[PDB]
Symmetry: D4
Subunit: 113 residues, 8 copies
Amino acid sequence: GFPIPDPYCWDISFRTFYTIIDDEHKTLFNGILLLSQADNADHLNELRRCTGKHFLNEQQLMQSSQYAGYAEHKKAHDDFIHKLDTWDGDVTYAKNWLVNHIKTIDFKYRGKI
Amino acid sequence: GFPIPDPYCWDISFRTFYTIIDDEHKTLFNGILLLSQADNADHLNELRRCTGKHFLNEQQLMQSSQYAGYAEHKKAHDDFIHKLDTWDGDVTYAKNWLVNHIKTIDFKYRGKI
Amino acid sequence: GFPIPDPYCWDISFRTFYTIIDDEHKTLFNGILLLSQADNADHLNELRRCTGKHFLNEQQLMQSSQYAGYAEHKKAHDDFIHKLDTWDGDVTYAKNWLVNHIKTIDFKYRGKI
Amino acid sequence: GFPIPDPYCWDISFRTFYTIIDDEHKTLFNGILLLSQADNADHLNELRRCTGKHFLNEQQLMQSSQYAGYAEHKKAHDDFIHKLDTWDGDVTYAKNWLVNHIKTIDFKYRGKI
Amino acid sequence: GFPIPDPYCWDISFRTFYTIIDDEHKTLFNGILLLSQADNADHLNELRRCTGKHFLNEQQLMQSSQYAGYAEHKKAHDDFIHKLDTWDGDVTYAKNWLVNHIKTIDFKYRGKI
Amino acid sequence: GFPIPDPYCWDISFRTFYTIIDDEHKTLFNGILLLSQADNADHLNELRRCTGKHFLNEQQLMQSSQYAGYAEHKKAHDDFIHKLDTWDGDVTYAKNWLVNHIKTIDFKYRGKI
Amino acid sequence: GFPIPDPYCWDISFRTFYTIIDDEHKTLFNGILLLSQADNADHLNELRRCTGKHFLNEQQLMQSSQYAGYAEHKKAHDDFIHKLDTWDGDVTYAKNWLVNHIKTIDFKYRGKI
Amino acid sequence: GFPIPDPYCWDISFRTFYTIIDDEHKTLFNGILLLSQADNADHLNELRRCTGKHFLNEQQLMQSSQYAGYAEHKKAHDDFIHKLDTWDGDVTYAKNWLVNHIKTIDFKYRGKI
């Protein structure tokens, strides 16, 4: 159970040490930040695009080293895409989801991929 | 229901703002233009090649961001390839199909991929 | 003196047999056609972007086989960019320039790159 | 004089329509925000890495179409690196620099690369 | 029914005008030539490697433009790999197979891929 | 039945003459060496990552030339990943497995891929 | 003095153990063989294209490991291009040049790149 | 003065957190170890190849973020190549050189590239 940064932006406590990964993460934080300012279609498209792109790249990176925790990781990802495809305006959920996902699921692959 | 450019060439009203996409689109317009001048095998091969190439690239681009409207988009594409594989000389259909596809189906992915 | 297509569009007489080159050429015909319809900034940008890109790609293809005619060919490309960058609205010049360039300068690399 | 976002995060007013460019820009906003929270070595490293990378990638994109404004644009980038490399802690300068750069220097390549 | 070159080497009558394709073809001719000089394991490995590599690349090239005659083309390829995997020393067959395959099946994709 | 190098490091008797392959092999030897010094999680992650990466690359290389002994080779690989995913501390097995795998299974693809 | 193959085709005595290099070499043997059958423009183009390409690729491979013999090796390649570019029809020279080059200059990079 | 591993193999104390860099480093330890077992041509070739390659790759990684320490770092690499190219058999020097280089010069780019 991790703190929710305020303002909702990436900080170095989220570093995975995979610079590509971290840079993509920065875009998810920003995506959620925009929704938190105006829940509209431009903002959701922006978050949705970045999310889909990051999840697939990250998935690719896991596959490249035949990561053993892939399947569970991909299912987490897919659930979240799914929430975005049926967006309900629950910004709070999203803020929480990302913090947790990174600090628990992503942090797990460090050193194995 | 959009106007059919005359001569049948790409114009900036078709811009998707994905330069690779737009450049490929220019080749589909030209492909249909040739058929409209001489319905022969050279012209149809030319259009067919460009169409198959563009549809797959565009499909790839959609997949890279796990675009939610992929499946419907790919089925549209496949139907059209199919018409080209059973070419009937209906140039009018083709002129119409492309204008519409771009301005309705392709324009839909803008900002999401 | 090669004939100037009317409408000013690519035809199979311009084929180089390098599909990537041919698809790019189609974009240069389109760029000149748009300027002939309306000599504005959007149209010139489009043509200028496609030209710079095509010239560099073709240059790279020449370099990959250490093509003996590279220097002279690069100089010809560069002279045309210069014309685009100091654009005077002479569409006639451009229409002629492109037809001639493909049919006499580009046609000379066929089989050598 | 463009408005300085507060919190200092990317918004869609900064859109260039080049998704890769936009995602990188988001990382530069984040880098400046972290320094505004704490002017330390980690934060500066992060910003410096993202900046060097973005500047080189954008430069490459400009080169790929032989963009006529390249030289002047590269010089502007280089002047900012210099500022990062001789960092004096002037966060205000940086916040202004980035907003201005995107909205007047980067916006000028749109449609040309 | 085409002539069998003697010596068994590639000639320009086999040009497909896809330089990558032609260069790979040259290696298949050489592969069969070696077997024709000494039917041993080194020579067959050499032909087998080149064959497998060429067939997959060529297949990839067909897929890139969603070539309509792919399936029939791939099945031809697979039959031949199969003969190589159960090599019987029938060099005559191999000499014949390749000449025919190129001049009938490969020549068919020209202009469509 | 091959000797187990002591110290457990790669030597030129293991050369496959595929430099990429050999360089990756060097990392598997090192991975097993670390486990042999301290059976901990850091060391096993390190070996596991390198193993998964090498097996997939090698598999890719085999596929590129449609290697006939792929299926048997991939099943060997997968069994070993499997032992790593259920690590028992049997370092002896691992030392043996690798020496053998390289000198018997990997040496088999030489000249065919 | 290495023996000149007759027919003038690549054999496994020319193996470098770099499959990409070996496949390219096969194209250079073929190019010289065609010229020995008919000293014309098509044949010379073919050889000249394959040579320029091979020389640049091999050069790149040398550079990737910072090969200490690069300069001298590049100079040898360049001298041969020069001969192709000022072609006098001396097929004998070419047959000798290539055999010697591979067996004494290329063989020296083996194990170093 | 960092401790010299014995046996002379990579350990996790050398981690840079760049997996590609770490895997390459492992090859440099191995190269020096082989020379300590037998100071011959094969061993030196191996080390020299791996070194040239690693130095260039790491250099490229530094350039991709316009790393401010590049020049000085390149000079250090080049001085070592020089030592390998004028090899005197001083294994002691090499063992020390590598440990020191990683732990003080490479460690300085962490977080910046």
